[model samples]
Structures are given as C-alpha cells and as structure tokens.
Target: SGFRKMAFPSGKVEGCMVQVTCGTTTLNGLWLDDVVYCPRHVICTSEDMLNPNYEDLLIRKSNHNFLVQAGNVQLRVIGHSMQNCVLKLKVDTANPKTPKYKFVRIQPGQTFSVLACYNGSPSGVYQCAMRPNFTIKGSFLNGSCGSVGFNIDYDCVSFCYMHHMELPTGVHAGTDLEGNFYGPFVDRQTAQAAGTDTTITVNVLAWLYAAVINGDRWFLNRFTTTLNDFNLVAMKYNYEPLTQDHVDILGPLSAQTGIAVLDMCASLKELLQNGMNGRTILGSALLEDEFTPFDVVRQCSGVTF
Candidate 1:
C-alpha cells in the first residue's frame, strides 16, 4: 500500500572507479569470482544502503577495494552487494549467454576473510531480507562482500566481473514478480496474515522515525511470538533504544519482509501524476514532513525496477 523505494548504503566515492573487461563482441554471461554467475546487474545507489552512513565512507576500484569508518578505524570489505547494502560483482557477455552463481548465504556476524589479503581496511554492508519461512531478516554490514553474474545481448557477448549494489526507486517493486526469490506464498501470505502489505510503505520508512522517538512502541506494537523469539536471539551489546549511541539495524533479512510497492501503483498512478502537475519522478512535496507514502511514481529512464 506504499511505494517501492530502493537505495544503496551510504558511503563516499573518493577516487574509486569501476573496471570493465569485455573480450568478445556480444554480451553473454557473468560469473562470481569467475565461479557463480548471473544475467543482469546495475550500478545504481540504494537508499537503505546509503542513508545510514554516519560519516563519509570511501571506495576504490583500483585493486578493487572498499572501506567504511568505524570509530577512527577503517575496514576493507567486498562490495557486499553490488548496488544495495551488499554490492554485486558482474560479468557481461553478449548474446546467448547466461551467468551462474553459487549462492552464499552470508550469515549474521560472518566475515569476508577473502578480503584480508588485499591489505585494505575491512568494511561491511548491512541489509534487510526475508527468509523463506516468512521471518524478517535485518542488519547492517560487518564486512562488505560480493557475488558474481553474467549477461549476453544481440549487439555483443561479454562478461562483467563486478559487485551487485542496490536498486533504485521503481526497480524494487518487481522483486517477487516471478523471480527466484518469489515463492508463491512469499508476500501475499505474510501480508494477509499480518494485515500489513508486503510492500515497504512510506509509512514504514517514515515509521523508522517513530521508532527513533517512540523507541519500542511503534516497531514492536504487534508483540507477536516471532518478535519475542527474535528479541531472544538479538545481539547483546552496549547500546539501548533512545540512547546516545546510534544503533545500526543489522541482520537485514530478519528485520524486513522483502515486500515491494508495485501493488499500490495500479491505484495511485493517476493521483501521483496529478500531484506532480503531470510531471513524474519526485519533488520536495513528496519528501515533506507530512508526505504520502504511495507517491513514488516514476522510474529513471532505462530503469527496470
């Protein structure tokens, strides 16, 4: 009932740039570390990934390394996601090509030891995802990691060895629209039972504020058995709600349901178009203190989400 908003974790682009390697004429496939593979990928920044950045972070495409700030220290990490919190590493090959990837489920508190040899400071990208059981998974990064992918096109065949970052605006709603993560009972079942749409709504996003000021009240109002179980397993650290210490939401897959916002668009497109005076994209009004959650209307040209 809200909008689909996707963004990469916040970090800085000091002097890092992407490296492209194409040896053929047509685009074909991508393989992770020349191992796992995929079909397509993007180079966009995601909001959830970028927003939580407390201070400036850094990225360097050279020798392929990224770092984040942590109390006067910097840690090197994998892309984690190429575009989102966990960045992607892609391989682009032209026409009639497909990529394969060995899905590595990065567990909470996991570290990317592969990066240690790089001699760069280590960093991680946190993310929120959904388990097949309909449980919410959430968290911030402890170390950035990456996977591999492949793609092919009629014009050429090539492979891009890169990271998968975060998706942007309109791209997120298409998540479960018949893809790998979309189990038949994924979104609707959970939303129906909870009386909450699987789509991450504007209310939910803004509600993060309510969580900040109201602490446990708004976020934990439902008081369900699942949440209590979650609380039991939550990490015990030196932080408390509404305290001076800033707590980064981590173990992303648990905290979020992976619901998207496409369902609401069928009903709100006209209203959104009208609100923007026939123009699309977004504006200040959509981001005000009092904002409509369903107002994210347009996608960047050539964007698929």
Candidate 2:
C-alpha cells in the first residue's frame, strides 16, 4: 500500500493539547494523555505528492477534512490522519471564561460554525483541535495520534474603520482591502499617523504577481478588483494611467523567446482570471514565461515582489 503513516512526538510529550478562542466563543480543555506509542516516519508515497507544482490540485482531493466558518472567515484543516481521528469541541460565547463544557464529538469531514460578535462585527479568528480515536485492551481512547501530517488553509477578514475607503457601486472589491488598496508605507509621515499611500505604487503589481504565482485566490482577486477599481477612479478623476518610458521593452524579449510577453499587466490579468476560474495548472505554467516582464517591471519601478 502507498499509504503514509502518522507520526507523533516521543517521550512525555506524546499527547497534544490546544485552546481556541474566537471573539466570544472558546474551546478549552485538558491535554490528551492516553495514546499509542509508535515511531513516526515521513512517508513519501508518490512523485506527484512530493512535487510543489501540483499541491494546489492535489489539495482539492485530499482525504483529511475539518472546517471552521466564522462569518466571512474560514479555517481549514486537512490531513491524511484525519480519516481515523475524532475531535472534542466545546463552544460558548455568553460566558466563555466559565461556561459549561459540553463535549461534542466531531468526526472527520464535518464543519463547525462559531457565532460571536464584537460591536456588531462579523470578522474574527478561529481555532480547532484534533486527536486520534483508538482502542486498547477493550477500552476506547481518543488522544494524540503520531505522525499526523496535514496542510492548513485560512483567511481573515478585517473591517478597516479608521482610514479605509469604501468602494463605489458596481465595483467588485475582493475579500480583503488593507494591503491591496492602501499602505505598506515607506514615508515617515504616513507611517507615524497610520495613514494610507496617496499615490499607487508598482509594489501593488508586484504583490499581485506574487499572489498569482503562489495560488492565493483571495489575494489574486483582491489585487485584480482593486486595480480595476483604481483605474475607474483615475478615469473619473481625470488622471492618466501610469506608464513607463520603455513601453516596448518586451519587444526584443518576446522576439527572442517567441512568447508574447508584450503587456505585463495584461498577462497578469489573464493569469489572475485563469486562477480564479480554477485553471491554476495552466496559469502557473504560463506564468513562467511572464517572469521576464515581471522582472523588467520591477527594474523600471523599483519594488520588491
């Protein structure tokens, strides 16, 4: 069989314990004590599993499953060991400090939602815990299982009340706007006051490229939508679109490589669309050709991706 075995820490730290709190809701309990003793090994079952190029696609079909949904935020836990695992969950928002502990046995492939608020806000963090379900000498035990390997995917949504702009009507603003629309400032004045950038910089584009290459759907959409919205805003304000002096720099590069790297922004937009449409395989492969344009853009604009 090509199955991977789960691993756990040796010695006295074999069991696992975790505490999770989301706004008013909390899951607190004792550390697991009873577990089996086994040697952990890192199992590499296939070349596809080892390759970073296919991780995104493989995740879609992975066996492990756990999900926590808190308003617009999502926390996912997927792993091979989850198939034989069970979770003990206790949640309460009213009296989180000393709430009644109701042990809810959650199996794998199930989702849990947390309901709590901060001044009528829907944004917050989520946490989870897991353990293996096993029996020894006719007694069942749910404790830390060894060699559990998994991937975590999460997203957080924050409402910027202080210095963030609200997008106009008919505009599609993606999940988050903090880094996409505003400042990771370089100026002393803005940094001191927690202010936003007055002018859009090439760093935005660089961030978008990074997002596209890394298969960050949320970030890719956020960057694309914000840039389009910015273009509309510029047009309304009677400002010219940002352009460089050497617009035809890609002419020679494309001629040599025979790949059309003519417009960096256009290529980036296409890649973003492809990724959003679940064509990440093609999008990532095609993105390798556009690296030249990305490099040139960085050189001309002086920004790190």
**TM-score per candidate, chains pooled:** 0.20, 0.19
| Model 1 CA lDDT for position 116 | 9
Worst 10 residues of 1 by lDDT: 110-119
Task: Give all candidates' CA lDDT scores.
Answer: 0.23, 0.25
Off by over 4 Å in 2: 1-246, 260-267, 271-275, 281-305
lDDT of 2 by residue, 76-109 (tens): 3233221111222222222112212222333221
Model 1 stretches astray by more than 4 angstroms: 1-30, 40-181, 185-206, 209-305
Best lDDT goes to which candidate?
A: 2
Per-residue accuracy of model 1 over 15-102 as CA lDDT, tens digit each: 1112222111111112223221211222212332333331223232421332232223332333323222222332222212222212
